[PDB]
Design an enzyme around this catalytic site. Structure first.
Site, PDB file in Angstrom:
ATOM      1  N   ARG A 135      -3.387  -4.062 -18.344  1.00 25.52           N
ATOM      2  CA  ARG A 135      -4.134  -3.104 -18.217  1.00 25.52           C
ATOM      3  C   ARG A 135      -3.764  -2.053 -17.036  1.00 25.52           C
ATOM      4  O   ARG A 135      -3.922  -2.266 -15.253  1.00 25.52           O
ATOM      5  CB  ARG A 135      -5.045  -4.054 -17.730  1.00 25.52           C
ATOM      6  CG  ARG A 135      -5.221  -5.242 -18.750  1.00 25.52           C
ATOM      7  CD  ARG A 135      -5.902  -5.507 -18.334  1.00 25.52           C
ATOM      8  NE  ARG A 135      -7.491  -5.395 -19.569  1.00 25.52           N
ATOM      9  CZ  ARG A 135      -8.047  -5.671 -19.962  1.00 25.52           C
ATOM     10  NH1 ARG A 135      -7.315  -6.750 -21.006  1.00 25.52           N
ATOM     11  NH2 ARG A 135      -8.784  -5.202 -20.999  1.00 25.52           N
ATOM     12  N   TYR A 139       0.604  -1.485   0.004  1.00 29.97           N
ATOM     13  CA  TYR A 139      -0.063   0.288   0.191  1.00 29.97           C
ATOM     14  C   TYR A 139       0.562   1.071   0.066  1.00 29.97           C
ATOM     15  O   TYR A 139       2.011   1.392   1.093  1.00 29.97           O
ATOM     16  CB  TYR A 139      -0.804   0.492   0.481  1.00 29.97           C
ATOM     17  CG  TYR A 139      -2.738  -0.207   0.983  1.00 29.97           C
ATOM     18  CD1 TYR A 139      -2.827   0.285   0.519  1.00 29.97           C
ATOM     19  CD2 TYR A 139      -3.245  -1.361   0.822  1.00 29.97           C
ATOM     20  CE1 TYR A 139      -4.338   0.710   0.067  1.00 29.97           C
ATOM     21  CE2 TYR A 139      -4.955  -1.570   0.846  1.00 29.97           C
ATOM     22  CZ  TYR A 139      -5.339  -0.403   0.506  1.00 29.97           C
ATOM     23  OH  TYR A 139      -6.481  -0.679  -0.011  1.00 29.97           O
ATOM     24  N   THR A 146      -5.961   4.699 -22.489  1.00 30.24           N
ATOM     25  CA  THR A 146      -5.054   2.488 -21.288  1.00 30.24           C
ATOM     26  C   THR A 146      -4.036   2.407 -22.161  1.00 30.24           C
ATOM     27  O   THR A 146      -2.985   3.251 -22.540  1.00 30.24           O
ATOM     28  CB  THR A 146      -6.298   2.000 -21.631  1.00 30.24           C
ATOM     29  OG1 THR A 146      -6.110   1.654 -23.483  1.00 30.24           O
ATOM     30  CG2 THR A 146      -7.830   2.747 -21.224  1.00 30.24           C
ATOM     31  N   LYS A 151      -3.555  -1.771 -25.098  1.00 30.24           N
ATOM     32  CA  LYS A 151      -4.624  -1.362 -26.354  1.00 30.24           C
ATOM     33  C   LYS A 151      -3.048  -1.531 -27.131  1.00 30.24           C
ATOM     34  O   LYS A 151      -2.154  -2.167 -27.020  1.00 30.24           O
ATOM     35  CB  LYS A 151      -5.107  -0.360 -26.766  1.00 30.24           C
ATOM     36  CG  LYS A 151      -6.722  -0.999 -25.296  1.00 30.24           C
ATOM     37  CD  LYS A 151      -7.946   0.373 -25.988  1.00 30.24           C
ATOM     38  CE  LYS A 151      -8.967  -0.032 -25.510  1.00 30.24           C
ATOM     39  NZ  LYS A 151      -9.148   0.702 -23.778  1.00 30.24           N
ATOM     40  N   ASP A 208      -8.514  11.534 -25.704  1.00 32.53           N
ATOM     41  CA  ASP A 208      -8.140   9.721 -25.273  1.00 32.53           C
ATOM     42  C   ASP A 208      -7.302   9.342 -26.220  1.00 32.53           C
ATOM     43  O   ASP A 208      -8.221   8.777 -27.293  1.00 32.53           O
ATOM     44  CB  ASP A 208     -10.224   9.647 -24.856  1.00 32.53           C
ATOM     45  CG  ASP A 208      -9.838   7.799 -24.767  1.00 32.53           C
ATOM     46  OD1 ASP A 208      -8.836   7.516 -23.844  1.00 32.53           O
ATOM     47  OD2 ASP A 208     -10.673   7.477 -23.961  1.00 32.53           O
ATOM     48  N   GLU A 246      -0.599   4.752  -0.936  1.00 33.09           N
ATOM     49  CA  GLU A 246      -1.768   5.783  -1.119  1.00 33.09           C
ATOM     50  C   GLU A 246      -0.508   7.296  -0.921  1.00 33.09           C
ATOM     51  O   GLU A 246      -0.119   7.707  -0.483  1.00 33.09           O
ATOM     52  CB  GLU A 246      -2.009   6.026  -0.080  1.00 33.09           C
ATOM     53  CG  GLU A 246      -3.435   5.062   0.050  1.00 33.09           C
ATOM     54  CD  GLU A 246      -4.438   4.567   0.971  1.00 33.09           C
ATOM     55  OE1 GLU A 246      -3.679   3.734   2.271  1.00 33.09           O
ATOM     56  OE2 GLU A 246      -5.213   5.015   1.133  1.00 33.09           O
TER      57      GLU A 246
HETATM   58  C1  LIG Z   1     -13.168   0.774   4.199  1.00 31.29           C
HETATM   59  C2  LIG Z   1     -11.684   1.098   2.947  1.00 31.29           C
HETATM   60  N1  LIG Z   1     -12.585   0.501   2.333  1.00 31.29           N
HETATM   61  C3  LIG Z   1     -12.212   0.785   0.472  1.00 31.29           C
HETATM   62  C4  LIG Z   1     -10.931   1.445   1.283  1.00 31.29           C
HETATM   63  C5  LIG Z   1     -10.285   1.211  -0.492  1.00 31.29           C
HETATM   64  O1  LIG Z   1      -9.692   0.285  -1.041  1.00 31.29           O
HETATM   65  P1  LIG Z   1      -8.523   0.340  -2.295  1.00 31.29           P
HETATM   66  O2  LIG Z   1      -7.556   1.183  -1.874  1.00 31.29           O
HETATM   67  O3  LIG Z   1      -8.502  -1.126  -3.095  1.00 31.29           O
HETATM   68  O4  LIG Z   1      -9.413   1.608  -3.882  1.00 31.29           O
HETATM   69  C6  LIG Z   1     -10.255   1.443   1.709  1.00 31.29           C
HETATM   70  C7  LIG Z   1      -8.629   1.135   1.793  1.00 31.29           C
HETATM   71  N2  LIG Z   1      -8.305   1.530   3.247  1.00 31.29           N
HETATM   72  C8  LIG Z   1      -7.105   1.808   2.849  1.00 31.29           C
HETATM   73  C9  LIG Z   1      -6.647   1.537   4.174  1.00 31.29           C
HETATM   74  O5  LIG Z   1      -7.397   1.867   5.190  1.00 31.29           O
HETATM   75  O6  LIG Z   1      -4.712   2.043   4.946  1.00 31.29           O
HETATM   76  C10 LIG Z   1     -10.770   1.108   3.124  1.00 31.29           C
HETATM   77  O7  LIG Z   1     -10.206   1.113   4.203  1.00 31.29           O
HETATM   78  C1  LIG Z   2     -10.921   5.171 -26.440  1.00 33.46           C
HETATM   79  C2  LIG Z   2     -11.230   3.744 -25.344  1.00 33.46           C
HETATM   80  N1  LIG Z   2     -11.153   4.944 -24.500  1.00 33.46           N
HETATM   81  C3  LIG Z   2     -11.530   4.686 -23.120  1.00 33.46           C
HETATM   82  C4  LIG Z   2     -11.583   3.037 -22.772  1.00 33.46           C
HETATM   83  C5  LIG Z   2     -11.259   1.786 -21.255  1.00 33.46           C
HETATM   84  O1  LIG Z   2     -10.897   1.207 -20.802  1.00 33.46           O
HETATM   85  P1  LIG Z   2     -10.896   0.298 -20.018  1.00 33.46           P
HETATM   86  O2  LIG Z   2     -11.345  -1.119 -20.668  1.00 33.46           O
HETATM   87  O3  LIG Z   2      -9.734   0.187 -19.599  1.00 33.46           O
HETATM   88  O4  LIG Z   2     -12.096   0.963 -18.584  1.00 33.46           O
HETATM   89  C6  LIG Z   2     -11.786   2.679 -23.793  1.00 33.46           C
HETATM   90  C7  LIG Z   2     -11.900   1.267 -23.781  1.00 33.46           C
HETATM   91  N2  LIG Z   2     -12.443   0.450 -24.742  1.00 33.46           N
HETATM   92  C8  LIG Z   2     -13.055  -1.115 -25.383  1.00 33.46           C
HETATM   93  C9  LIG Z   2     -12.749  -0.885 -26.608  1.00 33.46           C
HETATM   94  O5  LIG Z   2     -13.561  -0.689 -27.423  1.00 33.46           O
HETATM   95  O6  LIG Z   2     -12.682  -2.446 -27.051  1.00 33.46           O
HETATM   96  C10 LIG Z   2     -11.587   3.268 -24.654  1.00 33.46           C
HETATM   97  O7  LIG Z   2     -11.597   2.484 -26.146  1.00 33.46           O
END
Ligand SMILES: Cc1ncc(COP(=O)(O)O)c(CNCC(=O)O)c1O
Ligand SMILES: Cc1ncc(COP(=O)(O)O)c(CNCC(=O)O)c1O
Lengths: 98, 466, 466, 75
Positions: B252, B61, B243, B246, B217, B63
């Site tokens: 990803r 982690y 992204t 692609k 984008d 942040e």
């Molecule tokens: C209760 C809770 N919900 C959601 C998240 C978000 O998780 P992601 O980082 O995967 O987005 C956290 C992260 N909390 C980090 C910490 O407490 O150290 C959390 O503590």
């Molecule tokens: C132009 C563009 N911008 C953003 C995204 C979102 O990417 P993520 O799946 O990583 O969220 C896509 C996905 N497009 C998928 C497709 O055209 O087949 C995209 O084509």
């Protein structure tokens, strides 16, 4: 074209400086095509409308608003007219009411 | 009553811990090297990227930003992220005094939504390329009925712009007219099924005339952009999102580029204020901890993308798309805009009386993966086809002409099945069961695909080799 | 002029492709097994999870739900996702007629925001646990000055509830009073630094009285929930979100559980309508393609979490947190609520005249990673400490008492340095350079940590073994 | 209106298989026989490529430099 792009919930007709009558039937056609309510603000021509001297917005609009002090020749106030009762035939469920 | 020993639960290989998931992955590895992968948003990334993706980096982690973290243990996470950011700037030939980058977005859709959050307030107006004109969901999408589908259209006020109905190119004049009427705070360019390059100069002129921010984008063509094989959005856009999986051939993930330093001639010596807003939008506004295994894998992909081999790859992708497009037109098929300037072709099937649904379904059964795609004024009427994935397996123009012939056979079969069984999907499906010609085409496709190399794993070591 | 061969760019190992990232990862692997990792949101996941995470699954695009995808090639992706969903329901002892689950959220923060998007309109009212009372950013956060920090507070209208100022437990009566005044559409329970269990029954009573939906974010204690070692939010909440990397010991990902079927006694035989809204919010509203390598790795983690060893792990985590908490109190340190019922302790440093900043900084230098944490009525006044990561390396109660002693030494040093050099951070830092006692403590910590096993990679094979 | 490429960029072999076939048979006649007509010859592929080219699309009445209308820069 703009209505089908923008998709308004409400289209207003009526105006303050338009020297022609309004095609409310065409407004109804456009509103039905895009899914909007249709409101006429007849403030300027309300007196002509009451006298049946211009097209009536009531034949096609859902709501008609107006002032009372312009061509209607009354005090300064407003009114809101609205349709009531069963809706005319339309993808609309039977027994639909306003 | 006791815990499993660390060696039992924690060091044992996947093949023994979870044979059922191990088996399913080996089957997917086999599907990937025994078919023709024409999904334009897919690619096959390198083993080096996959090794960084699958690493202890997933345990950390962190942040915050490097150097400005909320807690410790980040000596090495910070160097990996700092390296990723600097390699991002280098791969796109950007001066660090003029451009900054944030590499924490989980994917492209989070990248876009964080960019919007940074520079817009809720309900601010946005325009992007209409979905039937080749745009992406995250650029705004609401239905004829008014249902707001994209989160972009839920939390902001979006209005699409379209391609010219005759040519299939962006209608720049109608966009200018609409932007002056609607007055967006943000105009988006780039898309997911647009087969031509973009006039970013003209987008900047429209944005300056109407007072809008300009964001590109470049998700789909990012790899062509890095290789300098298409126009660079950075010359004209305030913000560039992308992204990384692609045509960039990475993990990803997403990235947000933003301008820094002096603004062009407003108060004098006025400067851009994107950096802090964008970093803050990503964290703490929208995301939690960065996925540091994605960031390390992305740093690897950005080193690979800066190589002469990748520049040659990007040229080859373009050449493969053109060679496939020319093959199909030679058979009498209709391409949107009549060709391509990037990695994809858009194939309008309406002249044949076919839907995208039928063509996609039939050659999914022959191990050819395409995607049905809306086409202008549309049951999608076309199919989208991309070159990045098969080019990464080493294919060149005459291999893509063979792919053209497989598609020609598939659409020929689709026409025959539709003629014999009917146009309703229920009826069309009758022709897909025990169809010798389908089985024949599938066999031909699989023998063709098996001849090519495959990045990311060793075909010599996989479980299903037949 | 030619592309690199597939074997050169695509099959060569990371050590050769990118020595610089390979070196940085090996250094991070070494940091992970030579320190004491007390970040309460961290864990060390299994090699089997890491092998699925780092796999060809990263190459597949699969927008949509299994069985209802936007394009093909998904024969095996669909089985992996269907397996992940069914194992999610089993690990939490849920009947599939009463509960459904979506396993595509990229992480916990996207999971929460998609849940909100599913069931709320923009600007709808939300309450969650205040950040100084132990709540999380995604539950809402705005500053005294009115700046909206969390996206939850940007796009919705949030109001926090607090712990009782005397006891540190949730103030259920003041929450009920506030909910009746504010009338939230959604009440959130769960948090990130709350050391007690939750009275979900009382939350349901408050939600029913005020007409709110009830959502639990069980990210931190999900592994204890699956092992049935803490109260189950599923008995009372409409929606349950979680991350999968904390006490659940999985990859970084999120899940959204939701009720299905008949509602409790409203029209008769009325049923829940969450499933479609939640699936649609995740895709196509907010995300793009699922990260299928995360989903496969998550399916592995959910199989491991359903084992008797994991139930024993969860008990041990709780026992380790209690044993550490009791050790610190014995030295005269103050814990919030005077103990713990889950995986963490919250250590209030204000009675010592210390900030969280100083204690976190000093033992980061001794390879002990904690996080400064706000405490009620707060320069954070405390530190948060978690047992999941070190328990996963095999540690038990008396190892956690040794960890208590290392912390006792660190805070003793912090007091001495602050007494000798001063309380301003600039002045306090003077005591951190060439401090023999710090070097001594660091050496002791590193010898201690090196004795324990390490999941996820083989210490015998790592580059830095010294 | 057909898409331009369907009528305008497709090869003769598929647009008009009968004419393509007749030309193929006449190419075969030209190299399986003894052509002794004193006014016949076999011209070069380079000549044939210039003959079947976009030059057929251009009207250019008059003389170089002394034309009836524009667009004749390269003609
Ligand atoms: C209760 C809770 N919900 C959601 C998240 C978000 O998780 P992601 O980082 O995967 O987005 C956290 C992260 N909390 C980090 C910490 O407490 O150290 C959390 O503590
Ligand atoms: C132009 C563009 N911008 C953003 C995204 C979102 O990417 P993520 O799946 O990583 O969220 C896509 C996905 N497009 C998928 C497709 O055209 O087949 C995209 O084509």
């Amino acid at each position: 074209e703009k209505a089908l792009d923008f998709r308004p919930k409400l289209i207003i007709c009526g105006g303050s400086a338009y020297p022609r009558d309004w095609d409310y039937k065409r407004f109804r056609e456009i509103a039905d095509k895009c899914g909007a309510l249709l409101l006429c603000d007849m403030a300027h021509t309300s007196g002509l409308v009451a006298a049946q001297e211009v097209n009536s917005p009531f034949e096609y609009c859902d709501i008609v608003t107006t002032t009372t002090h312009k061509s209607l020749r009354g005090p300064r106030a407003g009114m809101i007219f609205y349709r009531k009762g069963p809706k005319p035939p339309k993808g609309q469920p039977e027994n639909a009411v306003y | 009553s006791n815990m499993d020993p660390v060696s039992v639960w924690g060091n044992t290989p996947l093949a023994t811990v979870d044979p059922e998931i191990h088996d399913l992955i080996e089957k997917e590895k086999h599907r990937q090297c025994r078919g023709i992968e024409l999904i334009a948003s897919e690619n096959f990334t390198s083993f080096a990227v996959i090794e960084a993706l699958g690493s202890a980096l997933t345990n950390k982690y962190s942040e915050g930003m490097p150097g400005n973290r909320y807690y410790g243990g980040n000596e090495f996470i910070d160097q990996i992220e700092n390296l990723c950011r600097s390699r991002a700037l280098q791969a796109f030939h950007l001066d660090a005094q003029s451009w900054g980058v944030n590499v924490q977005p989980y994917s492209g859709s989070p990248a876009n939504f964080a960019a919007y959050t940074a520079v817009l307030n809720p309900h601010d107006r946005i325009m992007g390329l209409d979905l039937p004109s080749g745009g992406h969901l995250t650029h705004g999408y609401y239905t004829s009925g008014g249902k707001k589908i994209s989160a972009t259209s839920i939390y902001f006020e979006s209005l699409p712009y379209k391609v010219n109905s005759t040519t299939g190119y962006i209608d720049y004049d109608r966009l200018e007219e609409k932007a002056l009427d609607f007055r967006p705070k943000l105009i988006i360019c780039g898309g997911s099924a647009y087969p031509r390059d973009w006039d970013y100069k003209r987008f900047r002129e429209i944005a300056d005339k109407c007072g809008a921010l300009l964001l590109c984008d470049m998700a789909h063509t990012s790899g062509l952009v890095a290789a300098q094989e298409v126009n660079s959005p950075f010359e004209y856009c305030d913000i560039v999102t992308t992204t990384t999986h692609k045509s960039l051939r990475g993990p990803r993930a997403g990235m947000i580029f933003y301008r820094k330093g002096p603004k062009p001639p407003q108060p004098e010596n006025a400067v851009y204020d994107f950096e802090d807003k964008i970093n803050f939008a990503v964290f703490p506004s929208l995301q939690g901890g960065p996925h540091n295994h994605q960031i390390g894998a992305l740093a690897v992909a950005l080193k690979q993308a800066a190589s002469p081999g990748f520049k040659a790859y990007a040229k080859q992708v373009k050449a493969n798309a053109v060679a496939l497009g020319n093959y199909l037109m030679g058979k009498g098929y209709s391409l949107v805009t009549g060709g391509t300037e990037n990695h994809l072709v858009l194939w309008d099937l309406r002249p044949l009386g076919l839907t995208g649904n039928k063509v996609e379904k039939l050659c999914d059964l022959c191990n050819i993966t395409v995607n049905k795609n809306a086409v202008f004024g549309d049951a999608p009427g076309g199919v989208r086809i991309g070159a990045p994935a098969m080019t990464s397996r080493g294919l060149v123009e005459k291999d893509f002409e063979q792919i053209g012939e497989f598609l020609h056979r598939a659409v020929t079969l689709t026409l025959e099945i539709q003629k014999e069984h009917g146009k309703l999907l229920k009826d069309f499906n009758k022709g897909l069961v025990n169809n010798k010609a389908i089985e024949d085409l599938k066999a031909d496709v699989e023998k063709f695909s098996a001849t090519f190399d495959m990045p990311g794993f060793l075909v010599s070591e996989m479980k299903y080799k037949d």
